[PDB]
Amino acid sequence: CKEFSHLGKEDFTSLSLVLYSRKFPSGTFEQVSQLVKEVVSLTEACCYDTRTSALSAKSCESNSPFPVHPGTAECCTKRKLCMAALKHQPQEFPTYVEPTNDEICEAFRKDPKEYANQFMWEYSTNYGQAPLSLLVSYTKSYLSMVGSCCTSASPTVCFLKERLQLKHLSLLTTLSNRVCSQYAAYGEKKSRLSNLIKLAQKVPTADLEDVLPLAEDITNILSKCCESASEDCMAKELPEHTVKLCDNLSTKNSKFEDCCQEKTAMDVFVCTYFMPAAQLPELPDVELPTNKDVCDPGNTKVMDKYTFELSRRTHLPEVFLSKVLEPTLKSLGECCDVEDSTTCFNAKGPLLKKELSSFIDKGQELCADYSENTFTEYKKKLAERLKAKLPDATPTELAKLVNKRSDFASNCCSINSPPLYCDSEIDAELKNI
Numbered sequence: 001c002k003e004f005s006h007l008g009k010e011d012f013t014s015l016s017l018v019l020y021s022r023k024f025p026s027g028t029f030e031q032v033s034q035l036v037k038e039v040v041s042l043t044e045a046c047c048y049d050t051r052t053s054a055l056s057a058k059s060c061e062s063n064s065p066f067p068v069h070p071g072t073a074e075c076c077t078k079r080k081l082c083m084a085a086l087k088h089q090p091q092e093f094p095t096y097v098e099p100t101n102d103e104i105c106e107a108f109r110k111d112p113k114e115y116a117n118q119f120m121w122e123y124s125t126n127y128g129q130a131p132l133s134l135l136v137s138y139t140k141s142y143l144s145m146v147g148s149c150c151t152s153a154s155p156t157v158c159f160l161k162e163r164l165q166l167k168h169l170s171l172l173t174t175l176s177n178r179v180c181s182q183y184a185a186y187g188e189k190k191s192r193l194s195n196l197i198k199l200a201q202k203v204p205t206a207d208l209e210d211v212l213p214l215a216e217d218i219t220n221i222l223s224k225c226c227e228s229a230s231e232d233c234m235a236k237e238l239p240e241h242t243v244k245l246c247d248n249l250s251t252k253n254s255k256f257e258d259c260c261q262e263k264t265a266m267d268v269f270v271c272t273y274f275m276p277a278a279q280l281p282e283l284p285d286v287e288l289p290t291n292k293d294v295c296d297p298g299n300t301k302v303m304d305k306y307t308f309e310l311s312r313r314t315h316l317p318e319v320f321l322s323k324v325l326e327p328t329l330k331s332l333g334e335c336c337d338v339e340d341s342t343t344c345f346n347a348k349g350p351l352l353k354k355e356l357s358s359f360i361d362k363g364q365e366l367c368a369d370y371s372e373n374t375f376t377e378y379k380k381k382l383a384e385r386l387k388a389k390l391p392d393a394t395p396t397e398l399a400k401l402v403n404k405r406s407d408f409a410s411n412c413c414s415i416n417s418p419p420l421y422c423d424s425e426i427d428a429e430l431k432n433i
């Protein structure tokens with residue numbers, strides 16, 4: 001109620017559209033607009049579960065106006081406020097594409113309101129994991145640009161200049177959506193390890209000491225800035241993070257040196273982000289940390305050292321590594337709070353080693369040749385491998401397997417593969433062939 005008054009009607013409604021578009025990434029323009037239509041109608045005539053209930057209720061109605069969370073129609077079976085318990089899944093495959101200047105201005109003069117609403121909805125559903133404060137700030141600035149540029153002396157020049165002034169906020173928002181989505185999908189502890197893994201893969205040359213502080217720092221920034229309703233801090237924190245990146249890795253790797261030479265902190269960050277897993281020196285094998293030092297609740301130095309060492313020695317994608325480390329380390333951890341840890345470790349050790357080895361072997365089998373070749377060249381070697389394992393396979397059957405397996409590998413064998421999507425795709429591929 002307090003916000004509705006201080007913000008007004010139209011503005012409070014704008015905030016809501018962005019707010020609810022983030023919540024229902026899969027929702028349609030119509031549905032989200034409809035839900036917001038009545039959420040305001042509520043606040044207004046209540047500034048009260050008389051309307052709050054009418055909302056949750058009219059939400060289950062088969063073929064309902066409102067957008068639906070996965071599990072809504074399910075747990076609706078009725079309390080009945082299970083809906084608030086349901087967590088929303090991010091959109092990992094953004095499809096937002098900015099129209100041409102003409103497309104923008106024609107749409108804008110014809111219907112200024114719906115053009116801005118369609119934009120706030122589509123931009124927010126696509127990059128809904130970026131901080132609310134940032135989305136609101138970018139979409140308001142963007143609409144202001146559209147507003148002034150389409151009626152300027154020369155829209156073309158206006159747009160060229162104004163988009164340049166907005167590039168920073170623009171890249172910051174999509175970048176923030178990407179890293180915060182990964183953060184929300186994994187949770188703080190796994191995100192931290194995930195980032196430690198990726199840095200290890202990008203610079204196996206470095207020592208644990210060069211990358212750990214960085215995994216720590218990015219993690220601190222995300223837990224602090226990924227969620228803010230009015231004052232964004234991603235812009236305040238990320239630049240100094242690139243300074244740490246360069247201080248520690250600028251001289252440890254040629255490619256990092258080049259990244260660190262770019263014009264802005266944003267460019268340095270993006271550049272390091274897109275950097276793929278480099279060729280690994282292939283050092284000696286590393287045994288699981290089956291020792292009392294992993295029991296330190298105060299530190300994770302041991303778990304971090306193992307994670308780091310495993311990453312710079314095992315040619316496997318981070319989505320795979322992060323996936324198996326969690327259960328593995330948790331299993332080890334079960335030998336901590338017992339009367340005799342040594343006996344527990346000596347028993348669990350041989351078992352975890354085989355399970356890990358099996359997972360790793362299968363994962364490297366699923367991603368074989370992807371990283372070292374161009375997609376096309378990958379597709380070619382992949383077929384040869386399949387041909388050798390399936391001599392009686394018709395060319396059609398081989399084509400289908402090549403298609404399926406190359407689809408999986410393009411989605412889940414890259415350093416920046418989608419966590420949520422791959423988690424389930426990996427489960428399936430593991431019990432394959």
Ligand SMILES: CCCCCCCC/C=C\CCCCCCCC(=O)O
Pocket residue numbers: 323324327328331352355356359
């Ligand atoms: C989702 C990643 C799974 C990776 C498997 C590596 C081992 C993890 C350790 C313990 C969890 C158990 C899962 C394996 C099934 C066998 C059951 C058993 O532990 O006896």
